[PDB]
């Protein structure tokens, strides 16, 4: 395919090391008939572009910024066996590795003067494991805290480091790289990261004609709450009349899209899907659930994002769950459907989620830039 | 730590016997550049005080009125073994005692004329236990219903008692008393009760300059729903412009604070916390969770309510959970963050929660009255 | 610390990607009163240096080349779900990750003409995992096979790749890197790798006077058998008289040393050692077991390699097991004691073994180059 737009989220992920570092790298490119953006919490971004003219509706689309990682506790000074450690919260999903990896502290730090500022880069932390203690319920708090320093007793300029810590996380460095024998997969983080990037690489590439909204946020991998689930109001509809006939008429003429991450049949875990699947290196699968998870995506939603894909060349896929299996996955738009908009719940074929690497096709992004760019047009 | 402001929630809790009896004892003191209050359901109170002037924001703060207790069923006439009993619902948290205690019926009663009126006071009920049936899953419905009357067959003026059981609860009488050898703890109910009183003893004590909101409610110890989780709108913002630019600009210039209850290391259950804790007789600990409970409290929230505590003399503490442990605790503001305000989730060092007595320092209230009173000023 | 000799095994490990690629990187540096070396299987190296003169004895020392990794099967073509896979054998130890990582195929390929030749480099493989299938005995064959190619049906110059699968393994690419906040640890592979390198960087650095032997091999992480456990005979003693008085007299005047890997107290797994431990950034710990593992190292062995460490500046440590715990660890010399030589079983403080990264101090190598270099001169 093309290794030019694939070489865009790679340096992005390095700069978008976290949710707010993603936010920082988000607006640094996303700038230059309006084209304004709102930052609010410095983690939830909404990019509005004018060409709503009331009876034209909106073209909403969005994905979260945060990803399951290790959040450093308030002041977690753990000095054991001559090793300095920083206790961590199990933010988001679980899984093993975390264990091993480069590891680096990142995020905002409010200094002594009521002032917030962020900093990152350089390998400083690690999570060691047991081995010879033979065959290995495991993992309970006192296993995940990483090692930073190693000495005793004591015999961006940035203040050394000290104790003014946090809302701070830990991410593995080793920059994103292309994998497989040819070019059939890559990626490290990209847990709706890059989805909060390729969508941004679309709001400046799509043909200018109608109103388009790029809504990135935080907390989806937890609850969504403040930022990802209310209030989307006023942040989007700030134009022409407060809340009388400004909403309803416009939002019912609108169409929201979510850029999530579908799994697709695992070559080793083949008995985790059925019939309709979604292997890597393919277009965005239309995810349809109503049972005990209930995403959005209805009749006139799947059809309006399958023909829209076919017109600008496919392949569009479907499904992610099982009749017996399937859990939660309240991915952004569905809790954001409380606005009053029909939501297209799609994504990209990607397994080994909620971790710090492994499996995600190097072709799906070429289909995600198109179609969604074509979505940014026509009525 | 003066024995004068501590002798204020003691008679308060006696009058604030329930959620609506707290509401009644709330507005009776909370009265006399506005200073109005809304009651709505007669259980959810919002005290607004004017000095928002748009670009000044709000100074929101609140805590729920209700507490885990035994609510009497609709018409639960249980006559067994010559004893008259009233079946009860397991409202809120669980625990044993409830068992024993004085016990008294309370709440608002809707009489025959579409009219509601409340009444309480005097010991009438009790919950007896088994003993000689040897070593003692226990507790399942038929164990909690208390005994009121004891006879057969039949051989505020207030109608005798009869059958019109309101929405009626049961609380232990024995009024709040000071404990420990000196004055190092006390308290009975105070499950965010007193927090809906000390905050009220702050809205009339804080220096008059800016707009301040005291928001008490019900159902947090259940789900929050109607009263504690939407709509906070119009109840707070009823002034200057409907919902166009009245919100957003003002609420982003605002700062919400929650007055909860932190645990702090138990001298017997030491392995329920880590590093950062919060023993009794101390200032409000900054509770920080994002993992699988996700309260509010961010970077510029913890720092804005730690320096504000230090300026008016500390000690401010932190944390309440473990990396492996920790469950729910959707305490008020966090579900109320759906308004769109940054929330400080603090509280008071107190264990033996969700019951009818035991452990809560007699010094923490002297720090909670200050700091939060100092929060009611400056920008 | 010293970051010059530490920047030597880093490019070494990149070239010493396998056991025989270690062998290749071994002799390429280890060349230029004899100084000959034997290769035999192209995996077991013995470096002899003359200055035995019968009554002078030998100064034997050694460590294995191989490390627990995923060896590709004979012809394991697994085409599932449009993905091409290569089935792997669980060579050596177990553990998770392997899972994820860069992954690359390597080893000596025997081409069509009775001719063996090795090749490596570049990321081609990956091992993906399950996530949303909820809480995660796990791992049994059909989970470890990595993904190489991804397409169907078909619509050093080196032969493409085809089907002639050698004796071929898979290792993670991401080159060795320095870790911690300062310089308090690093390392990726180094599972007695680098021990088959720092010892090589000693046979050319030690003062020339007596006979010194550097004996590296394969299979210790399996059984030892051919290469690591007999016959060491004739490979070492090839000089002056066959096997009458050439051995016995010389080997009893000799002293063998093993360069293994000690654990040292884990900051999270503190209850896996007792009293005598060995934290990272320290000299070689004298490992002493006789119970149900029985390594070598006796009275005049521990004392002869503790005073020899103290004379050339310490710190020398001790122990690795527990009275109740401890398993196998038949590390090289002990099965090589069948020659008839007293063996010093030492190593380097390093946990998170038998995997492809994590923990190993960046100071221990500066102590391992010394002492053992001072051992190369004993009178």
């Amino acid at each position: 395919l093309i290794d030019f737009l694939k070489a865009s989220p790679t340096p992005f992920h390095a700069t978008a090391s976290l949710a707010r570092r993603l936010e920082a790298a988000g607006y640094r490119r996303l700038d230059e008939g309006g084209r304004y953006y709102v930052t609010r919490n410095d983690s939830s971004l909404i990019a509005i572009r004018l060409g709503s003219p009331l009876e034209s509706g909106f073209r909403l689309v969005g994905a979260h910024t945060d990803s399951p990682c290790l959040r450093v506790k308030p002041n977690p000074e753990i000095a054991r066996n001559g090793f300095l450690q920083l206790g961590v919260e199990v933010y988001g999903g679980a899984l093993f590795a975390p264990w091993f990896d480069r590891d680096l502290s990142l995020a905002g730090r409010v200094t002594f003067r009521a002032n917030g500022k962020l900093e990152s880069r350089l390998v400083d932390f690690r999570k060691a494991i047991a081995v010879i203690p033979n065959l290995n319920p495991i993992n309970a708090q006192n296993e995940l805290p990483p090692i930073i320093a190693q000495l005793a007793p004591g015999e961006t300029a940035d203040v050394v480091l000290d104790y003014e810590l946090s809302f701070y996380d830990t991410q593995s460095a080793a920059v994103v790289g292309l994998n497989d024998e040819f070019i059939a997969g890559a990626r490290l983080d990209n847990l709706l990261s890059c989805h909060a990037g390729l969508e941004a690489l679309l709001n400046a590439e799509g043909d200018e004609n109608c109103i388009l909204v790029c809504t990135d946020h935080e907390e989806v991998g937890s609850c969504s709450h403040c930022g990802a689930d209310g209030p989307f109001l006023e942040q989007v509809l700030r134009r022409l009349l407060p809340e009388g006939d400004a909403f309803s008429r416009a939002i019912q003429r609108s169409l929201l899209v979510s850029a999530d991450n579908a799994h697709g049949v695992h070559p080793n875990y083949a008995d985790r899907h059925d019939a309709n699947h979604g292997p890597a290196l393919n277009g965005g699968p239309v995810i349809k659930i109503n049972s005990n998870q209930r995403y959005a995506t209805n009749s006139e939603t799947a059809g309006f994002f399958r023909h829209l894909c076919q017109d600008s060349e496919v392949p569009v896929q479907s499904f992610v769950t099982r009749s017996d299996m399937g859990c939660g996955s309240t991915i952004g738009p569905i809790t954001a459907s409380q606005v009053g908009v029909r939501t297209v719940d799609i994504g990209l074929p990607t397994f080994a989620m909620h971790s710090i690497r492994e499996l995600a096709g190097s072709h799906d992004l070429a289909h995600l830039v198109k179609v969604l760019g074509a979505f940014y047009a026509s009525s």
Side-chain angles (χ1 to χ4, degrees), chain A residues 64-243:
Chain A
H64 58 93
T65 59
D66 65 311
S67 59
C69 59
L70 272 61
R71 181 87 65 94
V72 185
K73 287 172 176 169
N75 291 262
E77 297 291 314
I78 307 163
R80 274 188 162 268
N81 304 322
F83 319 123
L84 212 157
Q85 288 188 305
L86 297 176
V88 282
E89 291 177 35
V90 195
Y91 181 78
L95 279 175
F96 323 104
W99 295 86
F100 290 54
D101 303 313
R102 282 282 194 183
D103 302 310
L104 167 274
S105 267
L106 73 165
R109 173 179 281 181
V110 175
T111 52
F112 281 108
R113 203 174 277 267
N115 157 271
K117 199 170 280 180
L118 42 80
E119 196 58 42
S120 60
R121 210 67 210 166
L122 214 284
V123 44
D124 293 63
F125 305 83
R126 269 205 165 271
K127 287 156 274 182
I129 204 160
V131 275
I132 286 298
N134 285 122
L135 300 161
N136 293 317
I138 323 159
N139 308 307
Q141 183 178 154
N142 42 288
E143 270 187 61
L144 288 161
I147 180 178
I148 173 175
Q150 205 275 315
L151 254 163
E155 184 77 17
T156 164
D158 189 44
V159 183
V160 191
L161 52 110
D162 293 56
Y163 330 101
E164 192 52 34
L165 286 99
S166 283
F167 221 72
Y168 228 73
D169 306 62
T170 314
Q171 114 286 310
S172 182
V175 71
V176 179
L178 287 157
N179 305 316
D180 292 58
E181 195 156 59
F182 321 107
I183 32 89
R187 303 276 180 171
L188 183 145
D189 197 295
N190 67 102
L191 308 172
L192 282 87
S193 180
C194 101
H195 284 79
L198 293 158
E199 193 185 304
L201 285 159
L202 256 33
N203 210 6
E205 293 279 69
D207 294 316
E208 293 81 42
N209 57 346
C210 53
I211 53 294
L212 320 169
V213 170
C214 170
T215 173
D216 305 318
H217 34 64
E218 194 180 317
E219 276 84 43
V220 171
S222 185
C223 193
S224 298
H225 267 138
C226 192
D229 176 36
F232 286 87
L233 295 74
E234 290 187 50
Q235 296 172 341
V236 182
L237 212 314
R238 201 166 148 188
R239 312 91 205 272
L240 298 162
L241 213 281
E243 278 287 82

Side-chain angles (χ1 to χ4, degrees), chain A residues 25-32 34-37 45 47-50 59 61 196-214 216 368-370 372-377:
Chain A
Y27 74 80
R28 273 193 70 178
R29 192 225 66 87
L30 190 72
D31 55 312
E32 320 305 314
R35 29 70 185 87
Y36 324 100
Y37 64 88
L45 199 75
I48 323 97
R49 175 250 220 77
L50 298 159
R59 309 289 149 85
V61 58
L198 293 158
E199 193 185 304
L201 285 159
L202 256 33
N203 210 6
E205 293 279 69
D207 294 316
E208 293 81 42
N209 57 346
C210 53
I211 53 294
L212 320 169
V213 170
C214 170
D216 305 318
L368 198 75
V369 292
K370 207 176 281 180
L372 282 176
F375 150 78
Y376 280 148

Side-chain angles (χ1 to χ4, degrees), chain A residues 202-363:
Chain A
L202 256 33
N203 210 6
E205 293 279 69
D207 294 316
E208 293 81 42
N209 57 346
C210 53
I211 53 294
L212 320 169
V213 170
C214 170
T215 173
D216 305 318
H217 34 64
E218 194 180 317
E219 276 84 43
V220 171
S222 185
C223 193
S224 298
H225 267 138
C226 192
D229 176 36
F232 286 87
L233 295 74
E234 290 187 50
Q235 296 172 341
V236 182
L237 212 314
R238 201 166 148 188
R239 312 91 205 272
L240 298 162
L241 213 281
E243 278 287 82
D245 290 313
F247 252 29
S248 291
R249 287 178 64 189
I251 55 161
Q252 279 301 308
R253 233 282 188 273
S254 303
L255 196 138
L256 169 57
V257 183
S258 39
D260 195 49
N261 280 71
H263 301 289
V265 280
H266 204 295
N268 306 268
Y269 305 99
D271 57 306
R272 296 293 170 186
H273 285 124
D274 61 296
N276 31 31
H277 53 137
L281 286 78
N282 289 297
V286 183
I287 322 159
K288 287 164 265 57
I289 301 182
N290 43 253
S291 57
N292 214 312
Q293 289 159 279
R294 215 276 162 181
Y295 314 155
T297 314
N298 48 61
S299 332
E300 54 196 44
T301 296
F304 220 87
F305 202 80
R306 178 178 179 180
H307 173 244
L308 194 273
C309 185
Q310 195 186 308
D311 200 289
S312 299
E313 291 179 44
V314 275
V316 59
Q317 293 167 322
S318 59
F319 222 68
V320 89
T321 191
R322 282 178 59 178
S323 301
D324 177 59
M325 212 187 73
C327 62
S329 180
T330 54
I331 69 280
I334 179 54
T335 344
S337 294
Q338 271 47 53
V339 169
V341 192
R342 304 181 303 271
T343 306
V344 187
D345 209 303
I346 50 95
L348 289 183
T350 293
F351 232 131
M353 223 88 75
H354 291 226
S355 191
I356 342 165
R357 222 143 153 79
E358 180 63 64
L359 199 64
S362 180
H363 229 112

